[PDB]
Amino acid sequence: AMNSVFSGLDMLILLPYERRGTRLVVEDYRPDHIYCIGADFGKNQDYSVFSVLDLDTGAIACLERMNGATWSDQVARLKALSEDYGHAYVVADTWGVGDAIAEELDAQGINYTPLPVKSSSVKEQLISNLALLMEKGQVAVPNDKTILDELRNFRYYRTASGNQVMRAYGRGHDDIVMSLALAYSQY
Numbered sequence: 001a002m003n004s005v006f007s008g009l010d011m012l013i014l015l016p017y018e019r020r021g022t023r024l025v026v027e028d029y030r031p032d033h034i035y036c037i038g039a040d041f042g043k044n045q046d047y048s049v050f051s052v053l054d055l056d057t058g059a060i061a062c063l064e065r066m067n068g069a070t071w072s073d074q075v076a077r078l079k080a081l082s083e084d085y086g087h088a089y090v091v092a093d094t095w096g097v098g099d100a101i102a103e104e105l106d107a108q109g110i111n112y113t114p115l116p117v118k119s120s121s122v123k124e125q126l127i128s129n130l131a132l133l134m135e136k137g138q139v140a141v142p143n144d145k146t147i148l149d150e151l152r153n154f155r156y157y158r159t160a161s162g163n164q165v166m167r168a169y170g171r172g173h174d175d176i177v178m179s180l181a182l183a184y185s186q187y
């Protein structure tokens with residue numbers, strides 16, 4: 001596609017995994033490594049995606065995805081992932097998530113840093129970083145067709161005034177794309 005964002009998809013490293021319910025587990029926790037978790041919440045009927053990145057290797061160790069999970073359940077699942085990966089810190093897109101998730105992150109003692117995806121400018125910085133790392137052969141994800149498809153279908157458009165926009169082709173989703181970009185913002 002002429003308007004592909006991820007022109008370096010050919011350099012994406014593809015990793016085998018075990019599906020454990022809502023998790024795709026590439027590898028279990030290694031305590032000599034430091035991890036973070038990109039978190040795109042399930043604000044309403046959209047998916048929540050939590051991407052555990054090994055910051056020593058640049059590889060996704062685990063990716064959890066679901067939709068329709070309660071807000072509290074999303075936070076509990078994030079807590080469990082964080083704890084599983086050595087109190088991995090969460091890079092949380094807190095923009096427009098609502099008071100309950102924001103309060104729950106603090107109330108539950110989640111190890112997190114806010115990265116609100118609050119404009120097209122912020123989004124472009126996150127995505128361009130992911131795209132560059134990808135072309136450089138530094139991005140490694142679970143070899144799952146849904147993940148690869150969501151990256152393949154992430155495209156450039158232009159607004160009425162001529163500003164750049166990045167979004168899913170057609171009527172698609174970008175929760176996986178954004179979760180991965182949030183994780184890799186730290187790499």
Ligand SMILES: [Ca+2]
Binds near residue numbers: 041042043046048049
């Ligand atoms: Ca979402």
